[PDB]
Design a protein around this ligand. Structure first.
Ligand SMILES: CN(C)C(=O)Cn1ncc2ccccc21
Ligand SMILES: [Zn+2]
Length: 140
């Protein structure tokens, strides 16, 4: 579990979105595993605006933050998990590291702020859903 809180937005994995998220929907995209809902209070997070390929991510299944190198957001085939069939996911970054299903929502961060959230795992990789292209998160 985990979310990004930027302005009056809550950014979550689409597959972990609550009824309250869907009832306050701003934008969702299954291919990215992202959903954004509206909040009443303002959030503490800053979104990175950059093409960094190094950062640090939170792994709940280890209670640890790990420094990683990661690929640029791409369209990638993801094998079946407890929450999705095998499919193509877009805007996905991969790194070498530990990821189980419950790790989804952990933040990946660089020197510029939040890059994305854990969205995939298995076979020694962790996949992150990028948010740095979503420039509208920074306003309105
Ligand atoms: C201000 N908002 C919410 C948006 O632009 C949301 N958004 N983000 C990407 C994207 C792709 C097509 C259509 C809407 C999309
Ligand atoms: Zn950066």
């Amino acid at each position: 579990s985990g979310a990004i809180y930027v302005g009056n937005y809550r950014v979550v994995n689409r597959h972990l979105a609550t009824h309250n998220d869907w009832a306050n929907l701003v934008w969702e995209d299954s291919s990215r595993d992202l959903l954004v809902s509206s909040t009443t209070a303002q959030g503490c997070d800053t979104i990175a605006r950059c093409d960094c390929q190094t950062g640090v991510y939170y792994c709940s299944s280890r209670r640890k933050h790990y420094p990683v190198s990661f690929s640029k957001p791409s369209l990638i085939f993801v094998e079946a998990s407890e929450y999705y069939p095998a499919r193509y996911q877009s805007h996905l970054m991969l790194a070498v590291g530990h990821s189980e299903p419950g790790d989804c929502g952990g933040i990946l961060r660089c020197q510029h702020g939040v890059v994305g959230i854990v969205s995939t795992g298995g076979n020694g990789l962790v996949g992150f859903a990028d948010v740095r292209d979503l420039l509208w998160l920074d306003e309105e």
